Amino acid sequence: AHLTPEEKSAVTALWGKVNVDEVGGEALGRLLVVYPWTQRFFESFGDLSTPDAVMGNPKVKAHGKKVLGAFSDGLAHLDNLKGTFATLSELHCDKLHVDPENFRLLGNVLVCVLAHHFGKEFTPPVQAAYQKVVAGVANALAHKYH
Amino acid sequence: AHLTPEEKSAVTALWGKVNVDEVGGEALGRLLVVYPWTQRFFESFGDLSTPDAVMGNPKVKAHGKKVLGAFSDGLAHLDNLKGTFATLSELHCDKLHVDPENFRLLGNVLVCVLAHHFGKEFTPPVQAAYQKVVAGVANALAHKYH
Amino acid sequence: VLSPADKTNVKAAWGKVGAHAGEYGAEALERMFLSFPTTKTYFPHFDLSHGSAQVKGHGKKVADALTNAVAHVDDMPNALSALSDLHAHKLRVDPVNFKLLSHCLLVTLAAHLPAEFTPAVHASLDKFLASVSTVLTSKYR
Amino acid sequence: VLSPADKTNVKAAWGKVGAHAGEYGAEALERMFLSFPTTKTYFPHFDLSHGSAQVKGHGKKVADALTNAVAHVDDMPNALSALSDLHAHKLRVDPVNFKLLSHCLLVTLAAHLPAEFTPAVHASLDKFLASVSTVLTSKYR
Ligand code: HEM
Numbered sequence: 008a009h010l011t012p013e014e015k016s017a018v019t020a021l022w023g024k025v026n027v028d029e030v031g032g033e034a035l036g037r038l039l040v041v042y043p044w045t046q047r048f049f050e051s052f053g054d055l056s057t058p059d060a061v062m063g064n065p066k067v068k069a070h071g072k073k074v075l076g077a078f079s080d081g082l083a084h085l086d087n088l089k090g091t092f093a094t095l096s097e098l099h100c101d102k103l104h105v106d107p108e109n110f111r112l113l114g115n116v117l118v119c120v121l122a123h124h125f126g127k128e129f130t131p132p133v134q135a136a137y138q139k140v141v142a143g144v145a146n147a148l149a150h151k152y153h
Numbered sequence: 154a155h156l157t158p159e160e161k162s163a164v165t166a167l168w169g170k171v172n173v174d175e176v177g178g179e180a181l182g183r184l185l186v187v188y189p190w191t192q193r194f195f196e197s198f199g200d201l202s203t204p205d206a207v208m209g210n211p212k213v214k215a216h217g218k219k220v221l222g223a224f225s226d227g228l229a230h231l232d233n234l235k236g237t238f239a240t241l242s243e244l245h246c247d248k249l250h251v252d253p254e255n256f257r258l259l260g261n262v263l264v265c266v267l268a269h270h271f272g273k274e275f276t277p278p279v280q281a282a283y284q285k286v287v288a289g290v291a292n293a294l295a296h297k298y299h
Numbered sequence: 300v301l302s303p304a305d306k307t308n309v310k311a312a313w314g315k316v317g318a319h320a321g322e323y324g325a326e327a328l329e330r331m332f333l334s335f336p337t338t339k340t341y342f343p344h345f346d347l348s349h350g351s352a353q354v355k356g357h358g359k360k361v362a363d364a365l366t367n368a369v370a371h372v373d374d375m376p377n378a379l380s381a382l383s384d385l386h387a388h389k390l391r392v393d394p395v396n397f398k399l400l401s402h403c404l405l406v407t408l409a410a411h412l413p414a415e416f417t418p419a420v421h422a423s424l425d426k427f428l429a430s431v432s433t434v435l436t437s438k439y440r
Numbered sequence: 441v442l443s444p445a446d447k448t449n450v451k452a453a454w455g456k457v458g459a460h461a462g463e464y465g466a467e468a469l470e471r472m473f474l475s476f477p478t479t480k481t482y483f484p485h486f487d488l489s490h491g492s493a494q495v496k497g498h499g500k501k502v503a504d505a506l507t508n509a510v511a512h513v514d515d516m517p518n519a520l521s522a523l524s525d526l527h528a529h530k531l532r533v534d535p536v537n538f539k540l541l542s543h544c545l546l547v548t549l550a551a552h553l554p555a556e557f558t559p560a561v562h563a564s565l566d567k568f569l570a571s572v573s574t575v576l577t578s579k580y581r
Pocket residue numbers: 045048049073074075077078095099103105109110113144148
């Protein structure tokens with residue numbers, strides 16, 4: 008990986024406390040609110056007009072859960088992120104046409120959400136370990152683009 | 154870096170036509186003119202007051218020579234850029250304190266210089282190959298930062 | 300901020316482009332698609348083969364927009380208003396991609412204006428493209 | 441562009457920061473140094489260890505400038521003029537780094553303002569920091 012033992016323990020520990028369903032929904036909703044251009048991928052999700060609409064949308068909540076669950080799987084294979092995300096990398100490129108820059112934005116919003124959710128437990132060193140992961144995942148997903 | 158053989162050859166071929174000293178001075182001078190903040194490392198070089206002064210500064214030219222000479226040697230090791238640039242990576246971080254963003258800027262200026270120098274011979278596919286090389290070198294030089 | 304000297308530089312270089320603006324616009328796009336393949340994610344509906352009418356047509360519209368901006372270099376916000384609306388509300392291109400096309404336009408100009416692509420003009424064009432990019436991205440949020 | 445709702449959000453959130461602005465400035469720097477080690481190249485002369493008074497002192501200055509910016513949200517360029525001069529002509533920090541500190545400031549705020557850090561406020565703060573960043577880098581070239 009990119010991560011250190013101190014950093015893997017850091018990552019793994021915090022992740023045990025995350026409610027994937029809840030965090031996923033928050034992370035995707037915030038992406039759509041903070042960087043509205045990202046809404047171009049979700050025209051069929053319904054009302055995305057205001058922050059409250061975005062945040063309460065069931066389809067956003069559903070999708071967020073899907074994304075973070077896949078994200079969680081990668082946490083189990085921190086040593087082979089590329090192998091792990093190969094199929095999804097190809098899917099996002101070939102069928103979905105998602106600019107990989109979106110993976111980077113989501114990673115940053117996720118960090119924001121963890122800090123918001125965990126407060127003082129989300130210390131500078133823990134953040135640093137999560138920044139490495141998020142960058143790693145984004146790189147893994149962009150890997151099969153062509 | 155992800156260069157097919159086709160690409161390595163397109164790189165090697167054009168490079169054989171380069172006057173390293175000349176291109177080196179041009180690229181460094183243009184970096185200093187186009188992105189003036191990069192001048193921060195070179196106050197001991199004297200007069201950088203105008204484009205003309207930069208382009209004509211003997212120290213700028215000598216430094217460009219040195220930088221492009223190392224670049225040039227790296228082209229012989231396209232397959233092991235990281236190993237080839239490891240010590241230089243460490244020096245740039247530990248002793249010179251150079252933000253790796255500067256390597257990316259230089260890489261882009263280098264491409265503009267080659268395009269200017271080669272005209273029509275610098276085709277879209279040839280650019281694509283050099284883009285990969287310049288990204289590769291930048292990554293190799295930033296690799297040991299901590 | 301474009302200085303007076305910058306505006307002079309841009310008008311000079313762009314002038315030289317003249318009637319080739321559209322062909323140069325097409326070449327810059329092809330250079331971008333090849334060098335930065337992630338940019339293709341915004342053109343899945345296009346035939347991106349070399350010399351396709353779609354790319355040539357698009358390159359022309361891009362070049363026309365740039366000419367418009369040079370013409371009204373003192374009032375870009377107003378001159379590119381409609382285009383800034385289109386990009387912000389419909390196209391929704393991540394802002395990172397503007398820097399990639401800008402670089403490819405610079406390379407294209409460099410390859411075609413041997414005499415005019417001096418360090419000073421290079422600097423001015425870079426700033427000009429950054430300015431256009433800023434205006435086109437202005438209404439994103 | 442900062443909308444009236446954006447200005448209100450920023451003034452409310454920053455209001456709550458209140459006397460802690462200095463502490464949060466230091467924490468954001470700490471987060472920055474650890475998360476994005478390339479940023480350390482600008483402070484070779486500092487003791488960057490956890491608890492360093494140099495970082496604490498610098499944190500306070502950054503925070504005070506932000507407070508100044510909040511107070512002068514309609515007249516940022518003038519309020520931040522000396523600072524724009526300093527970054528452009530002396531410090532010469534690559535513009536890329538501003539986005540890294542901004543993200544770290546956001547994380548720091550999130551970690552300290554559970555209640556206030558709503559999605560709407562998060563969006564306003566991000567726009568505000570981008571605005572400050574733009575101003576600070578306005579005179580680079
Ligand atoms: C953390 C990074 C991400 C992961 C792990 C991830 C994972 C997934 C998964 C597991 C699916 C469902 C695949 C299936 O249908 O079998 C999916 C679909 C999708 N993802 Fe991603 N995703 C990520 C980020 C993003 C981002 C940032 C965007 C755009 C902003 C995006 C856009 C989409 C879209 C549009 C779909 C299709 C949903 C539908 O069928 O309506 N994803 N993703």
